């Protein structure tokens, strides 16, 4: 769509109306818009750095800055055909944001597919209210999930307590297991202790599933019988 | 900066995946992260994704692939079923150790299905529970197969099937049985193989 | 490359200090180029505002004047070059103070000496998280040189009813960082560094709505609003550096009559009985003021005493006279060049041992702040050529002072509550609506200046 | 996050505890540490879930029927109970029982006096609560005040989670028949969650946990502690808790 | 308090209504005992306790999901300068720019409300009615959420000419003066139009251009920025993000109105 002119210049056209006398009374917005001008450039703006990983956008390494033989043993003595092509488009293409955590988020849930069955709430409470010390995994205001493992891993890396991401990730994994075993034992023992004092529950999870299966299976029986009778004819 | 917060944001916490949302093969374990909402946010179609989920969705759980698509929709399914399987396993009490002391993608131990340790007894008002009894459904004439708590298990009999089995036939699944879950291991594919016995 | 770069942003003119290695230390070449180019911009009808910034953006805006050369111009007795240096610098400061178009200063990084002079005389001065503001002339045997004695008694918000917080800042040379400078009124706005690019574009776009007069109060209001659009909230875990107790200490101990001497301030520091920590803070001040030049302390004291009640032109002329006399050093009253050699050419951490310790008599100190017949001097004419006792636009576009808070509270006497004052200063006065730190500043003033 | 509520007169509570019941180090144990401990555990058990948006009373009502959430229920119960108890022993926010409270005592406890019902409550707590628990005087929908003793973290609001019977030890056929009737009534509900209506509300709550009396009284002497509690109730709160 | 309720007799139990009032008494006093909830998002509070424009951070815009832009396959490249990057197949909106534009637009709303002008809140997506109504009611403004009749501005005589009009004083107090038919028939044009979903409201934007009404809009990755006077880059698809921005603008308008009434009471 053509860059529109008549939405951002309402003040100028209104002032022409007022000066000519076509409009008698000044509108209520007139002085407000006069004191707060709209942005009227509507330009494409280049970018020179990827915000996420800090990679510089728009630098060409020269042959002088590659004085050493490449992996195939050949020196670089002249520019290649990629260096000679103007790369202005990269300056305007919105950069792809990248985080190592995402590679480490994919791994965790490949190693623990049943951690995907733990429901997650994506509704944020307030990102500014978070004050976490990742020296430990449990945090007040957070659940225990894969992100706890990964944030602890990143903490361990940035403090150089481990040099390799693999070892930090494994350490975080074992702390996560330590906490999960405690939680599951807490749940089981809480239920056991509740039953030992006369807690009378109604439908459990197993009975819930049984009743839903029954609801589905009744309709399935009816359809099967109807289809068999129809097929016979 | 905004980039660091985005890397730490809740959407970023969900690992990228594009596995089909309508898989019709074999399901051994969850493939998609279940997304939940509170009643208050559901009333306003708010799920923490980009776009408001349609009002038709009354359930509080979904799985999704893409926040937005060329079709101007979010690719999602209003299902959170795999959590009820896991919890049902936790109700059974049968346990399944790599949880004790460059990257390997293989499932580690149980893949988060259960963290219960092997040797423990369930006290009850009767007394120590000797064996775990669970309702189930015999599936088909075959070790038979039984649908128990969201898992398909192998049924072994004391002596032989009763007359109800062949009396009903392919409608045997309509009636509920009681099973003793003998044991539960997990194989390399990530599938749990419970062995039970009819009672 | 040239030490100052001049560029254009669609209506604004950008002046970038361009001496990264020396942290943008200001020269006579730099001062002269800036002065002449600002004289040109004052006549241009296509210029709306001037932006002052630095190429060495994060580390420094302007790390003082380049007074090492002034100290070598006096070791070789070339006193005329020092006179030219200070004439250029102070004429530039006078130009910036009286400029009729908006000037916006980006104090992103170290801001000291000449940097404060470049930034303190404009109604629009922006601090960032990197702003490190200081006035470290006492330890090089020099005085507050750039009109600071005129500005600080007027602009500083807290504990400045009788210029005593201004005196604390001048004499101690304490480094005031980031939002503390904004809260003290040393900066008028507080903007994150990452935003200063976008702000620079916005300042280049806005024009007066009609009749194209960028010298009107209307356009200054527009500039204020456009800067406000780029101010972000302070971080949640941020506390003002000077607690109420230390502000009480400063108010008590640096208060003086118009004849008070540094000995009075020392006696006050010794004789303080406020509280446990606020009494140790007075001892800290006692200690560090003893590492300062005894003569420069008194010179700064009298300069504040006289320039806090004078008008801008005569105050800057008085600074020029004092700098000239200190370079001449006819009677060896002041060890300026001898200590500038010490600490700006050898980088010796130990403080210069101040041999000359005496309480200079009032007349022995009046002749080092006056014109002289043997050597006439004058600042350079600029396009404005006006003078005034109070800033025209500063008070509108910075945080309110305790004086203004008292003026509002005392207008309701001749039943007020905290809510009334906070809501007033936060919501009703147009130029200060939604101003970043009104709430906390008003809480501080009400907490340590009134009872109800 | 669940945070411990601020109490009226917290400075006096930290300096001199509750007069006639608790010392400063006793009230610190029962409130400023136990309530903090419980709120931290509830936060860790509910953070990142729906329940984080609900008050502990609503949490315990929501999780009362779900066997696997029992731990959360316990936390949500104790927290709630621990503030019902503290609130009605705090010095202030000379209070006396209202006419309505004593009238309902005469209409419930066979026309008995309040002191006699207090002694009955002492006896009930002494016998039917071995170890940890709570003592309640509760009002049912029949306008009847009766004494309820829960073990550990049973709730007075929802009868299937009262936990009024210790099934670790032997029980009388009367208690077993009561459990059978309650199980049948639970099964009688049509709601898929399996919940029932129960309008019982607590009027008086006493904390029989070791966090309340152990430091100031000893292993025995819980009867003395309960007596001190019931003789020194905040009757403004207790009178407000009864529907007018 | 509760008229036309017949209590029960002490002999007989509580009735259903008595039980309701009894549990209400419980709810207001003791149901909230045990713990206070902190740092938890409540959807209604964006509407009734929106923050001031000066207190908005990038973090609170991000928690509302304002940064989540359209799919990269639906990009309108004229919005290039508003974009921070792409992540997970969608464009991320630069929230620093969103904050700057939002403060500018909020100041415009405040200035127009302070001048006694008419402010119109247009949003035609599903669950936007509550926020629009509350913004209008706290700004003494107007809103539409059902449908924008094309020609509502450029054909106001044929559409809005029949609905009633009213004279009001400086304090917005109805004067109850009798208007002439000629006065009633005149166009009453908004002084400011704010549209929450400008992509589905092109008619309103074009009418505002023709009728020369300044406009504010939430500009997503697929929306044309130049069609509005004061764009706000942000997510227009999430009710939380939309309600956050709308509540901010409504509070700015409320502050302008309060200032106007304050000086008119002095
Ligand atoms: Mg959209």
From Swiss-Prot, chain A:
Gene Ontology terms for molecular function: structural constituent of ribosome
Chain's gene name: RSM25
Family indicated by similarity: Belongs to the mitochondrion-specific ribosomal protein mS23 family.
Misc remark: Present with 1920 molecules/cell in log phase SD medium.
GO biological process: mitochondrial translation
Quaternary structure (record): Component of the mitochondrial small ribosomal subunit (mt-SSU). Mature yeast 74S mitochondrial ribosomes consist of a small (37S) and a large (54S) subunit. The 37S small subunit contains a 15S ribosomal RNA (15S mt-rRNA) and 34 different proteins. The 54S large subunit contains a 21S rRNA (21S mt-rRNA) and 46 different proteins.
Organism encoding this protein: Saccharomyces cerevisiae (strain ATCC 204508 / S288c)
Superkingdom of source: Eukaryota
Protein's name according to its UniProt entry: Small ribosomal subunit protein mS23
Curated annotation (Swiss-Prot), chain B:
One Gene Ontology term, aspect cellular component: mitochondrion
Location relative to the cell: Mitochondrion
InterPro entries: Rbsml_bS1m-like
Top-level taxon: Eukaryota
GO biological process: mitochondrial translation; mitochondrial translational initiation
Record's keyword terms, sorted: Mitochondrion, Phosphoprotein, Ribonucleoprotein, Ribosomal protein
Major subcellular location class: mitochondrion
UniProt keyword Phosphoprotein present: yes
GO MF annotations, alphabetized: structural constituent of ribosome
Subunit and partners: Component of the mitochondrial small ribosomal subunit (mt-SSU). Mature yeast 74S mitochondrial ribosomes consist of a small (37S) and a large (54S) subunit. The 37S small subunit contains a 15S ribosomal RNA (15S mt-rRNA) and 34 different proteins. The 54S large subunit contains a 21S rRNA (21S mt-rRNA) and 46 different proteins.
Additional free-text comment from the UniProt record: Present with 656 molecules/cell in log phase SD medium.
Family of this protein: Belongs to the bacterial ribosomal protein bS1 family.
Functional summary from the UniProt entry: Component of the mitochondrial ribosome (mitoribosome), a dedicated translation machinery responsible for the synthesis of mitochondrial genome-encoded proteins, including at least some of the essential transmembrane subunits of the mitochondrial respiratory chain. The mitoribosomes are attached to the mitochondrial inner membrane and translation products are cotranslationally integrated into the membrane. bS1m functionally interacts with the 5'-UTR of mitochondrial mRNAs.
Record's protein name: Small ribosomal subunit protein bS1m
Curated annotation (Swiss-Prot), chain D:
GO biological process, one term: mitochondrial translation
Keywords recorded for this protein, A-Z: Mitochondrion, Ribonucleoprotein, Ribosomal protein
Coarse class of the protein's main subcellular location: mitochondrion
Compartments, record wording: Mitochondrion
Recorded GO MF terms: metal ion binding; structural constituent of ribosome; superoxide dismutase activity
Ribonucleoprotein found in the keyword field: yes
One cellular component (GO) term of this entry: mitochondrion
Pfam families for the chain: Sod_Fe_C
InterPro entries the record matches: Mn/Fe_SOD_C, Mn/Fe_SOD_N_sf, SOD_C_sf
Keyword Cytoplasm on entry: no
More about this protein: Present with 2060 molecules/cell in log phase SD medium.
Function (record text): Component of the mitochondrial ribosome (mitoribosome), a dedicated translation machinery responsible for the synthesis of mitochondrial genome-encoded proteins, including at least some of the essential transmembrane subunits of the mitochondrial respiratory chain. The mitoribosomes are attached to the mitochondrial inner membrane and translation products are cotranslationally integrated into the membrane.
Record note on quaternary structure: Component of the mitochondrial small ribosomal subunit (mt-SSU). Mature yeast 74S mitochondrial ribosomes consist of a small (37S) and a large (54S) subunit. The 37S small subunit contains a 15S ribosomal RNA (15S mt-rRNA) and 34 different proteins. The 54S large subunit contains a 21S rRNA (21S mt-rRNA) and 46 different proteins. mS42 forms a heterodimer with mS43, building a large protuberance adjacent to the mRNA channel exit in the mt-SSU body.
PANTHER family: 37S RIBOSOMAL PROTEIN S26, MITOCHONDRIAL, SMALL RIBOSOMAL SUBUNIT PROTEIN MS42
From Swiss-Prot, chain E:
Compartment(s) where it occurs, according to its Swiss-Prot or TrEMBL record: Mitochondrion
Keyword terms, alphabetized: Mitochondrion, Ribonucleoprotein, Ribosomal protein, Transit peptide
Keyword Amino-acid biosynthesis in record: no
GO cellular component, as recorded: mitochondrial inner membrane; mitochondrial small ribosomal subunit; mitochondrion
GO MF, one example: structural constituent of ribosome
Top-rank taxon, per record: Eukaryota
GO biological process, one term: mitochondrial translation
General remark: Present with 6890 molecules/cell in log phase SD medium.
Entry's family note: Belongs to the universal ribosomal protein uS2 family.
Subunit structure comment from the entry: Component of the mitochondrial small ribosomal subunit (mt-SSU). Mature yeast 74S mitochondrial ribosomes consist of a small (37S) and a large (54S) subunit. The 37S small subunit contains a 15S ribosomal RNA (15S mt-rRNA) and 34 different proteins. The 54S large subunit contains a 21S rRNA (21S mt-rRNA) and 46 different proteins.
Function: Component of the mitochondrial ribosome (mitoribosome), a dedicated translation machinery responsible for the synthesis of mitochondrial genome-encoded proteins, including at least some of the essential transmembrane subunits of the mitochondrial respiratory chain. The mitoribosomes are attached to the mitochondrial inner membrane and translation products are cotranslationally integrated into the membrane.
Protein name: Small ribosomal subunit protein uS2m
Phylogenetic lineage: Eukaryota, Fungi, Dikarya, Ascomycota, Saccharomycotina
Boundaries of the shown chain within the full protein: 128 to 393 of 394
């Amino acid at each position: 769509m053509k860059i529109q002119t008549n939405a951002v210049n309402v003040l100028q056209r209104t002032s022409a109306y007022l000066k000519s006398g076509l409009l008698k009374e000044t509108p209520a917005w007139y002085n407000v818009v006069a004191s707060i001008p709209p942005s009227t450039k509507f330009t494409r703006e280049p970018r020179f750095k990827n915000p996420s990983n800090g990679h510089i956008i728009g630098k060409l390494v020269d042959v002088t800055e590659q004085p050493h033989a490449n992996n195939k043993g050949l020196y670089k003595t002249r520019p290649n055909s990629s260096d000679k092509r103007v790369g202005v488009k990269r300056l305007y293409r919105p950069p792809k944001l990248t985080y190592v955590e995402d590679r480490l988020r994919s791994l965790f849930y490949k190693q623990h597919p049943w951690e995907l069955s733990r429901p997650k709430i994506l509704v944020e409470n307030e990102i500014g209210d978070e004050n976490y010390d990742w020296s430990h995994m449990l945090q007040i205001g957070r659940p225990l999930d894969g992100e706890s493992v990964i944030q602890r891993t990143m903490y361990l890396i940035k403090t150089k307590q481990y040099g390799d991401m693999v070892e930090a990730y494994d350490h975080a994994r074992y702390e996560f297991y330590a906490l999960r075993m405690q939680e599951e034992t807490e749940q089981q023992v809480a239920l056991e202790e509740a039953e030992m004092f006369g807690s009378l529950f109604g439908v459990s999870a197993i009975e819930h599933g049984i009743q839903k299966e029954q609801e589905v299976l009744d309709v399935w029986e009816k359809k099967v019988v109807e289809e068999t009778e129809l097929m016979a004819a | 900066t905004l980039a660091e917060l985005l890397g730490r944001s809740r959407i970023a916490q969900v690992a990228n995946n594009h596995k089909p949302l309508t898989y019709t093969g074999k399901k051994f374990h969850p493939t998609h992260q279940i997304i939940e909402t509170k009643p208050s946010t559901l009333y306003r179609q708010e799920w923490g994704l980009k776009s408001a989920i349609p009002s038709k969705i009354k359930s509080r759980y979904l799985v999704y692939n893409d926040l937005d698509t060329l079709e101007r929709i979010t690719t999602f399914e209003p299902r959170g079923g795999t959590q009820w399987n896991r919890l049902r396993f936790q109700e059974m009490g049968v346990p399944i150790n790599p949880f004790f002391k460059k990257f390997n993608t293989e499932i580690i131990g149980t893949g988060g299905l259960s963290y219960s340790l092997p040797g423990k007894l369930k006290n009850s008002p009767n007394g120590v529970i000797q064996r775990t009894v669970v309702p189930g459904r015999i599936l088909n004439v075959v070790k038979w197969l039984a649908a128990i708590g969201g898992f398909v298990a192998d049924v072994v009999f004391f002596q032989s099937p009763p007359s109800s089995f062949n009396s009903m036939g392919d409608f045997i699944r309509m009636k509920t049985f009681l099973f003793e879950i003998l044991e539960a291991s997990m194989e390399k594919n990530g599938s749990v193989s419970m062995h039970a016995r009819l009672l | 490359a040239p030490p100052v770069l001049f560029t254009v942003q669609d209506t604004a003119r950008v002046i970038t200090l361009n001496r990264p290695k020396k942290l943008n230390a200001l020269n006579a070449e730099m001062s002269e180029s800036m002065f002449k180019t600002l004289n040109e911009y004052a006549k241009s009808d296509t210029t709306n505002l001037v932006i002052l910034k630095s190429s060495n953006r994060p580390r420094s805006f302007c790390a003082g004047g380049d007074v090492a050369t002034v100290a070598i111009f006096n070791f070789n007795k070339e006193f005329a070059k020092s006179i030219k240096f200070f004439t250029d610098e102070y004429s530039l400061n006078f130009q910036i103070a009286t400029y009729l178009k908006p000037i916006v200063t980006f104090m992103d990084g170290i801001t000291m000496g000449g940097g404060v002079g470049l930034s303190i005389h404009t109604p629009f001065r922006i601090a960032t998280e990197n702003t490190k503001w200081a006035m470290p002339e006492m330890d090089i045997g020099f005085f507050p040189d750039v009109g600071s004695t005129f500005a600080l008694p007027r602009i500083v918000t807290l504990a400045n009813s009788n210029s005593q917080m201004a005196l604390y800042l001048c004499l101690t040379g304490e480094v005031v960082t980031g939002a503390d400078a904004y809260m003290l009124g040393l900066a008028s706005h507080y903007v994150s560094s990452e935003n200063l690019d976008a702000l620079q574009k916005r300042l280049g776009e806005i024009s007066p709505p009609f009749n194209n007069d960028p010298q009107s109060a209307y356009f200054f209001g527009m500039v204020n609003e456009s800067i406000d659009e780029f101010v972000s909230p302070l971080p949640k875990d941020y506390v003002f550096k000077y607690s109420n107790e230390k502000l009480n200490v400063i108010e008590a101990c640096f208060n003086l009559s118009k004849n008070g001497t540094i000995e009075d301030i020392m006696n006050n520091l010794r004789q303080y009985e406020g509280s446990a920590e606020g009494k140790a803070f007075a001892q800290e001040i006692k200690t560090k003021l003893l590492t300062k030049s005894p003569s420069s302390l008194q010179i700064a004291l009298r300069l504040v005493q006289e320039n806090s009640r004078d008008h801008i032109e005569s105050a800057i002329k008085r600074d020029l006279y004092t700098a000239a006399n200190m370079c001449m050093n006819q009677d060896s009253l002041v060890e300026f060049s001898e200590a500038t050699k010490h600490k700006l050419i050898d980088k010796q951490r130990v403080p210069y041992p101040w041999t000359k310790k005496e309480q200079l008599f009032v007349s022995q100190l009046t002749s080092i702040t006056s014109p002289k017949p043997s050597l006439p001097m004058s600042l350079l004419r600029n396009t404005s050529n006006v003078t005034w006792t109070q800033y025209p636009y500063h008070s509108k576009y910075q945080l309110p002072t305790e004086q203004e808070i008292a003026a509002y509270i005392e207008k309701r006497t001749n039943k007020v509550t905290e809510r009334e004052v906070l809501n007033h200063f936060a919501n009703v006065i147009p130029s200060r609506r939604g101003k970043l730190g009104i709430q906390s500043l008003c809480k501080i003033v009400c907490e340590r200046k009134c009872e109800e | 996050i669940h945070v411990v509520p601020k109490l009226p007169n917290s400075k006096a509570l930290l300096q001199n505890g509750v007069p006639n019941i608790l010392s400063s180090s006793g009230f610190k144990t029962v409130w400023f540490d136990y309530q903090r401990y419980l709120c931290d555990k509830l936060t860790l058990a509910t953070a990142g879930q729906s329940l984080e948006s609900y008050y502990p009373f609503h949490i315990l009502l929501k999780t009362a029927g779900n066997p696997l959430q029992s731990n959360i229920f316990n936390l949500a119960s104790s927290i709630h109970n621990n503030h019902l108890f503290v609130e009605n022993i705090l010095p202030s926010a000379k209070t006396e029982p209202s006419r309505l409270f004593l009238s309902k005592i005469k209409d419930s406890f066979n026309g008995s006096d309040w002191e006699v019902v207090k002694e009955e409550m002492i006896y009930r707590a002494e016998n039917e609560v071995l170890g940890q628990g709570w003592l309640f005087l509760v009002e049912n929908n029949e306008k009847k005040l009766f004494i309820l003793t829960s073990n550990n973290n049973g709730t007075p609001y929802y009868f299937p989670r009262n936990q009024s019977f210790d099934l670790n030890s032997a029980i009388s056929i009367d208690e077993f028949a009561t459990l059978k009737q309650m199980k049948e009534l639970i099964g009688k509900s049509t709601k898929l969650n399996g919940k029932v209506q129960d309008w019982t509300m607590p009027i008086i709550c006493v904390n029989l946990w070791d966090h309340a009396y152990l430091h100031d009284y000893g292993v025995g002497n819980r009867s003395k502690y309960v007596k001190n509690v019931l003789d020194n109730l905040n009757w403004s709160v207790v009178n407000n808790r009864i529907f007018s | 308090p509760y008229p036309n309720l017949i209590p029960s007799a002490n002999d007989k139990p509580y009735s259903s209504q008595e039980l309701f009032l009894r549990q209400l008494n419980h709810s207001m006093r003791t149901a909230k005992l045990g713990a206070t909830i902190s740092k938890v998002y409540y959807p209604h509070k964006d509407i009734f306790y929106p923050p001031l424009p000066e207190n908005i951070t990038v973090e609170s815009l991000m928690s509302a999901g304002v940064h989540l832009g359209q799919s990269t396959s639906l990009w309108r490249s004229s919005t290039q300068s508003y974009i921070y990057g792409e992540y997970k197949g969608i464009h991320i909106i630069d929230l620093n720019q969103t904050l700057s534009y939002l403060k500018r637009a909020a100041k415009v709303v405040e200035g127009v409300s302070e001048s006694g002008g008419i402010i119109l809140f247009l949003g035609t997506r599903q669950g936007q009615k509550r926020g629009l109504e509350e913004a209008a009611k706290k700004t003494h403004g107007y809103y539409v959420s059902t449908r924008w009749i094309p020609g509502t501005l450029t054909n106001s005589t044929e559409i809005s000419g029949i609905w009633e009009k009213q004279e009001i004083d400086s304090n917005d107090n109805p004067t109850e003066r009798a208007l002439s038919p000629n006065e009633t028939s005149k166009q009453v044009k908004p002084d400011l139009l704010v549209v929450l979903n400008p992509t589905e409201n092109r008619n309103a934007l074009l009418e505002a251009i023709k009728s020369r009404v300044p406009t504010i809009a939430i500009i997503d990755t697929d929306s044309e920025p130049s069609l509005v006077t004061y764009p706000i880059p942000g997510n227009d698809d999430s009710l939380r993000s939309v309600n956050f921005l709308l509540g901010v603008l409504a509070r700015a308008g409320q502050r302008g109105l309060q200032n106007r009434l304050a000086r008119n009471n002095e």
